[PDB]
Paper text:
For marine invertebrates with no adaptive immune system, ferritin is a major intracellular iron‐storage protein with a critical role in innate immunity. Here, we present the crystal structures of two novel ferritins [Fer147 and Phascolosoma esculenta ferritin (PeFer)] from the marine invertebrate P. esculenta, which resides in muddy‐bottom coastal regions. Fer147 and PeFer contain both the conserved ferroxidase center and threefold channels.
However, the marked variation in the electrostatic potential of the threefold channels in Fer147 and the fourfold channels in PeFer suggests significant diversity between Fer147 and PeFer in terms of metal ion aggregation and cation exclusion.
Numbering used by the authors:
A (entry chain B), B (entry chain E), C (entry chain F), D (entry chain C), E (entry chain D), F (entry chain A): 2 to 171
Amino acid sequence: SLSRPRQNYHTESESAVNKQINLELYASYVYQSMSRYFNRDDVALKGFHKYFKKASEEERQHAEKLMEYQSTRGGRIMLSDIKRPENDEWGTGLEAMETALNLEKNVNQSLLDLHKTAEKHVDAQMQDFIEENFLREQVESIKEISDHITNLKRVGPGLGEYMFDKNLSE
Amino acid sequence: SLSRPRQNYHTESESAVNKQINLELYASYVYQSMSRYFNRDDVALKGFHKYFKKASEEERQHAEKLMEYQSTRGGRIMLSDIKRPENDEWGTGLEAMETALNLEKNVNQSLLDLHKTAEKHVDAQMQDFIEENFLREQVESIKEISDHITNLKRVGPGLGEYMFDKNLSE
Amino acid sequence: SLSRPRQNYHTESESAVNKQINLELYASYVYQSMSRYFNRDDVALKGFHKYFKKASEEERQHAEKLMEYQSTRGGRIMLSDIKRPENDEWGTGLEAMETALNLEKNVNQSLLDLHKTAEKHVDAQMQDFIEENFLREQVESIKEISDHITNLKRVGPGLGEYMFDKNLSE
Amino acid sequence: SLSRPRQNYHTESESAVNKQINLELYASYVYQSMSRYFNRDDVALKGFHKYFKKASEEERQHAEKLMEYQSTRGGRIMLSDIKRPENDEWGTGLEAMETALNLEKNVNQSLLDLHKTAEKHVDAQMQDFIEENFLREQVESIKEISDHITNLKRVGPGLGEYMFDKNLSE
Amino acid sequence: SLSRPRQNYHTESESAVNKQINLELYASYVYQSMSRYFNRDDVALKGFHKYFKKASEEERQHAEKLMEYQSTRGGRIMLSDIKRPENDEWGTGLEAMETALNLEKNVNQSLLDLHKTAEKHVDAQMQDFIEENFLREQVESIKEISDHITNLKRVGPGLGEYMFDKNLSE
Amino acid sequence: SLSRPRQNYHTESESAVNKQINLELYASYVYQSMSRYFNRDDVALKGFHKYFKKASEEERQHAEKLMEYQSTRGGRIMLSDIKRPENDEWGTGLEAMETALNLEKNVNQSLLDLHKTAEKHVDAQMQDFIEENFLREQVESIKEISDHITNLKRVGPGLGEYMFDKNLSE
Ligand SMILES: [Fe+2]
Ligand SMILES: [Fe+2]
Ligand SMILES: [Fe+2]
Ligand SMILES: [Fe+2]
Ligand SMILES: [Fe+2]
Ligand SMILES: [Fe+2]
Ligand SMILES: [Fe+2]
Ligand SMILES: [Fe+2]
Ligand SMILES: [Fe+2]
Ligand SMILES: [Fe+2]
Ligand SMILES: [Fe+2]
Ligand SMILES: [Fe+2]
Ligand SMILES: [Fe+2]
Ligand SMILES: [Fe+3]
């Protein structure tokens, strides 16, 4: 028996949503780790700390939006282990911004694949859901982090990193 | 000669819009009937009365939005009889929620087919109009009614129906 | 056996109430059709659009008042198909006001026959219900539409129609 | 050697965005010219002046939205000459509204071709961006101008044109 | 060499803080799973949904306070995989409250062991941190959950569960 | 036959006003290009972006002031192609400020020549119009840009540029 709300919602879409939930939880964990590292006494960049805290929270919210969507469509949420980040440490502000862009792009390609899944299965509603709730945000973020990387190179290490961080804080 | 505004609007889309206008007006009528049945002295469930009143109003508003859209694109509205509902009476609260779910699913499949019409004819604007104004709402409604059916089964007949109805009223 | 509330409510009155419900819903549909027609790109009279929208809504409200009354008295609402209007278009502002007057008079005569049903069966409460909630409004409406027809004749086609329509909008 | 933000953004799309930019800047210039013309001492229709001023501004805003989008995706803005309009004058209010409708339709077809480009390259983000920022507005404009042309024909020359112009002014 | 802030902070304390961070993240994930389960269409208990949402947020907050504390003392945060919960599905309200109590007791025993660690290494500040920020909250939660279980047993299944859930929603 | 308002308005002045309209439009387009260049991901100087956006808008406004003036005097606006800027990309902040100064001085010379036209033809009203609405502003912009170039040299590349851009933003 299909679940009562189930209508035009393929099993491959359902599976793919579960995968995407894990990815976003993972991304939130990476950002968490990045955030806490910048508040170490021997790193001490509170603007990077704050920027990656926000990132972490946003990723977790996106995972939760996917959880809700799964149940709304009549799919069943299947959770997996949230793997630990690749690194304990994250280097300079610039390095960590480069790390963040790579993660964002990874998550973006996963979202575009999830969109392609929905399209294949003629799931118009799921297409819209993804476009509105995920895709726009992702291209804004990629643009912003890329701007930050240009500026971190432009200011250089030492005082430059310190002044960039202050302006991240605001 | 086409109408002045007409641009990228197929006759099949135009026709399908008129069929959907009828469908939504029909659905409004069915909810009208349900609504008033629940205010009978020998039924007397004001929460269900209110819930199906709102449903009826919302289905008329969607028919009207489709009427407006037809003329905006340069289509011509063609109206047909609004058929009377299948029943005069609607049973218990649970029965009526099951009837509601079937109607919402039927309306949703028609919307999905209207979207496929728009897509076949490469009517991007129409696909967007349908996704934003119809498809989102329909999946919310399907989920809500499914929740209600679970809770009506969980409370049982009698006092349980009465208490659920109070909660619908708020 | 009779319904629990029922007292001094004849079967003929109950039947006639059902017929009146259909009539008013039909009237609402005619005014819906008129209203939309006036927002076509090749008609484009927003004052007439608004006027007939209001009319449509009012008719539906009166149908709904009769639905409620039927159940208040212990009668049973019996719905029928809502027939499609006799036309798809509606001509000039003047033509459509003439159409409206004929519809209002037809609905008035039905109301008056419904009152006579109530009087025949010595249903004083029904008579009072009909006078207060329907008859007064109908005389006012018939007068107003008559006034509009004199003015539409007085202004003439073209600019005059346009300026009448602006005043309808207000 | 792709730009840092670049992800799922075809060169075809990039170049089509540049062409659209030019087209909207052109359209803004046509509307500028029209707007000015209607404030000539020998034309003197301030409501048409204002209507085409607004249109000019909106077209420029949409060119600028496309400029911002190009850079957001990692594309590079390439500007071309903004060609001067086909005419120095613009005739009557009615003639100018006919001109405006032809311009809007032509901009709309370009937008629809831009959407087809995006679709062909499986650019889901781009599809959405065009739907929500461009396509909706364009169908509304086309309908409005079409309504204005009906009314300008209804009112006729002379006093009729003067009264329509007032109403445009508000 | 030790980190700059390091003073009176044992490696065993540092290690045990990392273990506790993992445990609280794990507990937050179990509560996440429970919370979403309760909003399934075929479960539909919004009060349990909300209760476990709040539980999940609080657990995450307590993990984050441990992260901050690790870095404040000069320790180094070490993250591990956050294991998926034991179940995908969580039964009745009553079953899930029993599950929650067993989780809270396990988290409390770990906190008490963490306090023993701090005491063995004569870390007065740590003891005070644990008492104030963790231990009080835990005994309250354990009391509250225990009260809920008594009440869930007292109301029984069906309507009783529904009414308890309303009261949780408040 | 002259236009009705025409008085003391030489054809050479009318011509020269059309040329100045084009110049200002061209200057607005140059600044628009400069503006959008500084928001590229690989340039990322939002203060410079803002500064040249304002410049672009101001130039447009001054073109439109000339447009209005032409029609006020009874002249006839004649539009020409707005040529595309000399460059696609505009170098560092300092380079672009040097570009801006040269543009400003070119536009100021044009204004001075337009004043000389008006003076030759004993057009006292025009001389004033130019002095008040154009000449004052242009010596302000020339002085401010000159100050900015001194400070861009003072601060140097890298962090200095970054900090000057922040101050531009404010
Ligand atoms: Fe995300
Ligand atoms: Fe993100
Ligand atoms: Fe609907
Ligand atoms: Fe609905
Ligand atoms: Fe009526
Ligand atoms: Fe009426
Ligand atoms: Fe446009
Ligand atoms: Fe969309
Ligand atoms: Fe437009
Ligand atoms: Fe905890
Ligand atoms: Fe807790
Ligand atoms: Fe200027
Ligand atoms: Fe200037
Ligand atoms: Fe009376």
